[PDB]
Amino acid sequence: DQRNEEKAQREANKKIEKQLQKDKQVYRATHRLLLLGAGESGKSTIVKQMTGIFETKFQVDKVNFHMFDVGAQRDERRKWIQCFNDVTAIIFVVASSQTNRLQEALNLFKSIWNNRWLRTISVILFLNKQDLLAEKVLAKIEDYFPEFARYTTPEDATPEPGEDPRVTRAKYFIRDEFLRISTASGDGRHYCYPHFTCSVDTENIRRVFNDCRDIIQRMHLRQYELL
Amino acid sequence: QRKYDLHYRIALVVNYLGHCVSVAALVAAFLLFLALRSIRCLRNVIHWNLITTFILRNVMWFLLQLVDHEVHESNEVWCRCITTIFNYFVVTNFFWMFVEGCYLHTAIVMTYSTERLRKCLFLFIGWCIPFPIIVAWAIGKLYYENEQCWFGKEPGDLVDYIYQGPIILVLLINFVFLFNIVRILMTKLRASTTSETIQYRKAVKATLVLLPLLGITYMLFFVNPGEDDLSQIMFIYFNSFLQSFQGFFVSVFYCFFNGEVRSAVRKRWHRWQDHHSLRVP
Amino acid sequence: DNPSLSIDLTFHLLRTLLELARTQSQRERAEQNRIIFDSV
Amino acid sequence: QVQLQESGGGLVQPGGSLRLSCAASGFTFSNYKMNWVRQAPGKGLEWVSDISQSGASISYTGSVKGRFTISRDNAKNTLYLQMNSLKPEDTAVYYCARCPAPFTRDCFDVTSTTYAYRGQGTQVTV
Amino acid sequence: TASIAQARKLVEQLKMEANIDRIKVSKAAADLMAYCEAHAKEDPLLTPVPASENPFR
Amino acid sequence: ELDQLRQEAEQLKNQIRDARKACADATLSQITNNIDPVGRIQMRTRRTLRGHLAKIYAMHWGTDSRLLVSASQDGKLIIWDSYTTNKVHAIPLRSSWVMTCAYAPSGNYVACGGLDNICSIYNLKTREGNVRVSRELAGHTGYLSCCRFLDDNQIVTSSGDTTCALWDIETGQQTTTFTGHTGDVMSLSLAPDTRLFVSGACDASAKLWDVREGMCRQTFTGHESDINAICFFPNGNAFATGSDDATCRLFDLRADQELMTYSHDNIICGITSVSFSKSGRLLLAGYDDFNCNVWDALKADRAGVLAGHDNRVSCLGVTDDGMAVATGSWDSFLKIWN
Ligand SMILES: CC(C)CCC[C@@H](C)[C@H]1CC[C@H]2[C@@H]3CC=C4C[C@@H](O)CC[C@]4(C)[C@H]3CC[C@]12C
Ligand SMILES: CC(C)CCC[C@@H](C)[C@H]1CC[C@H]2[C@@H]3CC=C4C[C@@H](O)CC[C@]4(C)[C@H]3CC[C@]12C
Ligand SMILES: CC(C)CCC[C@@H](C)[C@H]1CC[C@H]2[C@@H]3CC=C4C[C@@H](O)CC[C@]4(C)[C@H]3CC[C@]12C
Ligand SMILES: CC(C)CCC[C@@H](C)[C@H]1CC[C@H]2[C@@H]3CC=C4C[C@@H](O)CC[C@]4(C)[C@H]3CC[C@]12C
Ligand SMILES: CCCCCCCCCCCCCCCC(=O)O
Ligand SMILES: CCCCCCCCCCCCCCCC(=O)O
Ligand SMILES: CCCCCCCCCCCCCCCC(=O)O
Ligand SMILES: CCCCCCCCCCCCCCCC(=O)O
Ligand SMILES: CCCCCCCCCCCCCCCC(=O)O
């Protein structure tokens, strides 16, 4: 009676625990990512090339990756962003550019970087729309930011040849404006990985894979109290 | 006769003191790893297994210290049994050093293969693989050299290389792993710290603190000929200092200086104070 | 052709001490031989 | 009940000064980072400036840097904004906003459409 | 011309919420402490139970 | 035309404030000096449930005080037996971001929701032998934050698009809607007779809604930050809210104002889950500093502390007979304190 019922409950518990161990073997090998950005930044081209939430499954070198872009949600972000604290990286897409979009992107990046539950996660920064910046530098970046005049090109970075110097100057200026607030409260707990990407490009997946490799290797170095 | 006779006695005193301090630290590390259930990842399991191998090695060394020359001449059963169990725990200690080096190398270098490593495979490599290596030693020792409690070194004897060959291979593989870890740690520190001097200081600290874990200290002063007088004293004292205090250094750095273990001890002390309600009315 | 590996040092530490102890025992037995001379 | 009230504004000339005030009621003022956010007619909301809890960290937008001054008085429970050397592009509705969590450095929904922790704003026309 | 309907609905909601029947704080507080005092005997969290009738021990 | 309507609204709020100050005779902390204090509360972790992988976000007890649901962030909804720690069910979910879960008062259905804006109701009858998707409800434009069962046919849900909704499970459509909030509704709590329900939002407001009529009755604004949790009193005349300003607040339905405020000078962390006991004398509150606090609901004193979790406490639940308290935190551990 009761002994056979407890035996059946123990067998059901063993089957459920075997299914949970198989789902643990599946779940621990996959790496989660949070794709976040504005509507005009170009995340639609990212989810095309590379309901309230959309799921994107892919793999690099037999390594699985899920990317979760935000769908039909509101403008308020202070409550549903706390669920994304177990992800490995936040792919933050900005548009390198009429309202001031760069200052709003800097405010959102500062609010992510200085959040209480987002101190462990690293941010892969993607500065999209570089050809649009190359068009607009020819004929309002210096108006929204007066520090663009008193700024020179950093010699430690290696640009590609065949480019106008004002274009890469604006690129390095926006990158330094992100790294000024990125390197203010990091303290080695989490880093930012800026990249120069275009709308139609296929080299971004390798950048995401290498940056996630760097994040997990720095995590394993930090757990052994070495770095 | 040998010129240096008090040097072995003082080295025996140094080895006794080092093994006593090592036991007094590793028992506390054993208790702090069994009590803390918050940190139960694979890293703490492999460190706890290394601590258990060092404890069993030190206990069998203290049991092996008892013998006199009458048991060395008259071959007995319990003497060779103690030496066989001690050799088994030495080979198990080197295999768990190999498990630590392989897990650290697969966590740093090939970081997308950390989930292929299970607990059962590491326990099989650590404890279950060196069962025949001792037994094929002992059956290799019983038929050929059945004298002097199965450990007397004789000229023209090569049965002791059954269990030492894998130890030398483990030390070479751990040296290659340590070189790769130091190289990738330098690669990560070239882009993290702005100051180069702090980078070199952290690299020297990490190398000198990963030397006692992987067993590379035995490779520091490995060979020395027995013809010089001033070199043999440095050989015996330096190996005694690196062997008797190795488990102490491993226990101190991986139990006492770790931040997560100190945080867990302080949280359990706060929970015990809340159960006592000393600070709460 | 004598190997003095660091791994095999602990047994090496013991054996030599036992040899010294054996020598000391023979030295005491040498004194006992003197006692035999006291019997002769 | 959290309620913020703005004061100041009117028709001003380019190159003049104007002092906007923000009075708080219903919460502790010295625990929240405070914001000034404008909205131009024909455009969306855009963040102007902010001052921290103790008043140490003060940050601006680059388009408003060197011409605006944000201050706060925790004892008198008020938030001031000094507007000298104005520009005809600065005609907007100004809001004083409060970050939702106390004792923090992050502010998420300050420059949003439907946010309930700010006042009704004031019109500044140049 | 969109916030006028929201303001009108808010005025109607405050008009519905303003004209209600409110009870004094003392009588309601007496009712709350009477409810907390009457059922205080059968609360296993307030007053503990022995290990015989406790199913979790 | 906007100045006169908002001026009339401010005049109506001033009239409501004057009526609340006129009805405020004396506070609760003045007449509770005759009630004896409870003292130090000593509770221990009797059971510990460890079968989840990601962080446990919500739970709900059954009416028999035997089974309990628990939702995790890996796509798992596990139905536990609280007596012998045996896993009774383990439902894999479609989306791995779950923010709420509920258990039916009859014990037949289990609902769940999250960032996919769809409430999934599963059946536990198991005619074939396994569970399956019984119903999917999709009518919200924001994240579903809470869901509760009235009976086997109706379900009250609250979403992140400032809307609550009463749904009929059989027809698969909304019975009625509730559109009165300006911030994201975080949690709701039903009445003991299932006649009214309170709902707290992210604009520091808790509104009392009627189920059958479909219109707001009373509005309570006493907090300073986002109200994350709410819990109705066991008699049916009061409730308690927790917010991010480290203050719990006990509100009354009759007096239409706040009765008591539970706070401290050292507590500077947000509140995630609040619940009452069977008698209503104790008030348990889950904080963000890795432990829960058991306050006295009539003396405003921190009577006890439950400190056994390693990460942020996300959910807390008390049984119907008041025999145990199950607390779930972000370290994938359900601890049953008693
Ligand atoms: C935790 C630390 C401080 C414990 C230290 C214990 C020390 C003081 C004690 C315990 C065992 C003792 C040793 C026991 C045996 C011998 C062999 C004898 O022929 C020389 C003394 C010597 C070598 C003793 C020296 C002192 C000794 C090492
Ligand atoms: C010397 C022999 C006996 C070994 C003794 C080991 C034990 C008893 C000692 C040595 C180092 C000590 C630790 C030193 C530092 C800290 C950090 C503090 O915030 C918590 C206690 C804690 C963690 C101590 C606990 C006790 C400790 C672990
Ligand atoms: C299981 C692992 C640890 C190996 C254990 C080895 C030890 C405990 C066992 C295995 C083989 C055993 C030996 C088998 C045969 C003999 C010959 C007999 O005339 C004396 C005892 C002696 C010498 C035994 C001593 C103990 C022994 C050496
Ligand atoms: C004389 C020889 C035969 C003695 C051999 C003793 C062996 C069989 C015993 C002693 C210590 C034991 C280990 C003690 C601790 C652990 C950790 C646990 O998580 C897995 C089992 C494991 C790994 C045990 C396996 C069996 C074990 C290795
Ligand atoms: C798996 C077996 C573990 C235990 C092995 C015990 C080996 C005992 C060997 C014989 C010991 C005889 C001792 C006789 C008394 C003495 O002189 O000390
Ligand atoms: C596995 C076989 C080993 C069996 C032996 C285990 C217990 C040995 C205990 C020896 C104690 C010797 C104490 C000597 C004290 C002294 O120096 O006078
Ligand atoms: C004298 C011979 C003794 C042999 C002792 C054999 C020891 C076996 C150890 C088994 C370890 C099991 C590890 C876990 C396995 C699993 O997870 O499935
Ligand atoms: C006979 C012993 C052989 C030991 C081999 C250990 C495993 C070697 C792994 C090599 C990894 C090489 C990684 C290269 C990283 C890089 O610099 O790009
Ligand atoms: C020929 C030179 C050999 C040097 C051998 C050094 C052996 C290791 C010594 C340092 C051990 C670790 C000490 C620091 C521990 C810590 O506080 O982290």
Q: Which residues of B touch C14 (CB under 8 A)?
A: 64-65, 67, 151
Q: Distance between CA F257 and CA F16 in Å, rounded?
A: 10
Q: Is the Cβ–Cβ distance between F122 and F78 less than 8 Å?
A: no
Handedness of CA A90, A91, A94, A96 (dihedral sign): positive
Residues 6+ apart with CB under 8 A from B266: none
Of B107, B189, B210, the CB nearest to A227: B189
Which resolution in angstroms does this entry have? 2.8
Establish whether residue B123 lines the binding site of ligand 7, counting it when its CB lies within 6 angstroms of any ligand atom: yes
Report the candidate in B16, B84, B91 with the shortest Cα–Cα distance to residue B53.
B91
Q: Distance between CA B16 and CA C14 in Å, rounded?
A: 13
Compute the radius of gyration of chain E from its Cα atoms: 23
CB–CB contact F74 A12 (8 Å):
no
Q: Is the Cβ–Cβ distance between F154 and F166 less than 8 Å?
A: yes
Q: Return the CATH number at F92.
A: 2.130.10.10
Q: How far is B24 from chain C (nearest CA, A)?
A: 20
User: Which atom in ligand 1 lies closest to the alpha carbon of residue B24?
Assistant: 1
Domains recognised in chain A with CATH numbers: 30-223 (3.40.50.300)
Q: How many helices (DSSP H) and strands (DSSP E) are in chain A?
A: 7, 6
Q: How many domains, in total, are found in chain D?
A: 1
CA dihedral A81, A86, A88, A93 (to 10 degrees): -10
Which residue type does B163 have?
Y
CA dihedral B272, B274, B277, B281 (to 10 degrees): 170
**Structure tokens given for A4:** 């056979």
Report the candidate in F110, F47, F46, F107 with the shortest Cα–Cα distance to residue F78.
F110
Q: Return the CATH number at E46.
A: 4.10.260.10
CA atoms within 13 Å, Cβ hemisphere of A171: 26
Method: cryo-EM
3-state SS class at F235: coil
**Structure tokens given for B151:** 């450990």
CA atoms within 13 Å, Cβ hemisphere of F242: 30
Q: Where are the domains of chain C?
A: 1-40
Q: Is the Cβ–Cβ distance between F157 and F140 less than 8 Å?
A: yes
In A197-226, the residues whose Cβ lies within 8 Å of chain B are: 213-214, 216-218, 220-221, 223-226
Interface test with B, best of C1, C2, C14 (most B CBs within 10 A): C14
Q: Distance between CA F174 and CA F201 in Å, rounded?
A: 21
CA A173 to the chain's CA centroid: 20
Q: Distance between CA F256 and CA E46 in Å, rounded?
A: 28
Residue whose CB lies within 8 A of the most ligand 4 atoms, among B123, B127, B128, B135, for a mutation test = B127
* E-only strand ranges, F163-298: 164-168, 173-178, 187-190, 196-200, 206-210, 216-220, 227-232, 238-243, 248-252, 258-262, 271-276, 282-287, 292-296
**Structure tokens given for A149:** 């005049």
Alpha-helical regions (H) of B109-131? 119-123
| Long-range Cβ pairs for the range F15-20 (8 Å, 24+) | F15/E18, F16/E14, F16/E17, F16/E18, F16/F256, F19/E18, F19/E22, F19/F256, F20/E22, F20/F255, F20/F256, F20/F257
Q: Which residues of E touch F8 (CB under 8 A)?
A: 11
Q: Distance between CA A133 and CA A148 in Å, rounded?
A: 14
Domains recognised in chain B with CATH numbers: 6-276 (1.20.1070.10)
**Structure tokens given for F128:** 């074939």
How many A from CA of B63 to the centre of ligand 6? Answer: 6
How many A from CA of F71 to the centre of ligand 5? Answer: 56
Alpha-helical regions (H) of B36-160? 42-64, 69-73, 77-108, 119-123, 132-142
Q: Distance between CA A165 and CA A77 in Å, rounded?
A: 38
Backbone angles phi, psi at F146, to 5 degrees: -155, 155
How many A from CA of B176 to the centre of ligand 4? Answer: 29
Interface test with C, best of B153, B159, B167, B224 (most C CBs within 10 A): B153
- The partner residues of F114 in beta bridges, in order of sequence, read F98
Interface test with F, best of D1, D31, D103 (most F CBs within 10 A): D1
Q: Is the Cβ–Cβ distance between F337 and F46 less than 8 Å?
A: yes
Backbone angles phi, psi at E51, to 5 degrees: -75, -10
**Structure tokens given for B8:** 């072995």
Q: How far is F287 from chain A (nearest CA, A)?
A: 14
Q: Distance between CA B2 and CA B229 in Å, rounded?
A: 10
Q: Is the Cβ–Cβ distance between D62 and D48 less than 8 Å?
A: no
Q: How far is F331 from chain B (nearest CA, A)?
A: 10
Q: In chain D, after which residues is the C-to-N distance over 2.5 Å, breaking the chain?
A: none
Q: Which domain holds residue E23?
A: 1-57
Q: How many domains, in total, are found in chain E?
A: 1
Q: Which domain holds residue F224?
A: 1-338
Q: Which domain holds residue D46?
A: 1-126
Q: Concatenate the DSSP letters of all residues of chain D into one string.
A: --EEEEE--EE--TT--EEEEEEEESS-GGGS-EEEEEE-TTS-EEEEEEE-SSS--EEE-TTTTTTEEEEEETTTTEEEEEE-S--GGG-EEEEEEE-SSSS-S---SSS-SS-SSB---EEEE-
Only one residue has tokens 């304190």, namely F337
Only one residue has tokens 């990601």, namely F54
Q: Distance between CA A160 and CA F157 in Å, rounded?
A: 55
Which residue type does B49 have?
N
Q: How many domains, in total, are found in chain F?
A: 1
Q: How far is B135 from chain C (nearest CA, A)?
A: 19
Q: Distance between CA F148 and CA F102 in Å, rounded?
A: 6
Closest residue by Cα to atom 16, ligand 9, is B253
Q: How many residue contacts between E and F have a Cβ separation below 8 Å?
A: 141
**Within 10 Å of residue F32's Cβ, how many Cβ atoms?**
19
**Structure tokens given for B234:** 């440095």
Residues 6+ apart with CB under 8 A from F221: D1, D2, F204, F205
CA A37 to the chain's CA centroid: 9
**Structure tokens given for E46:** 């307030």
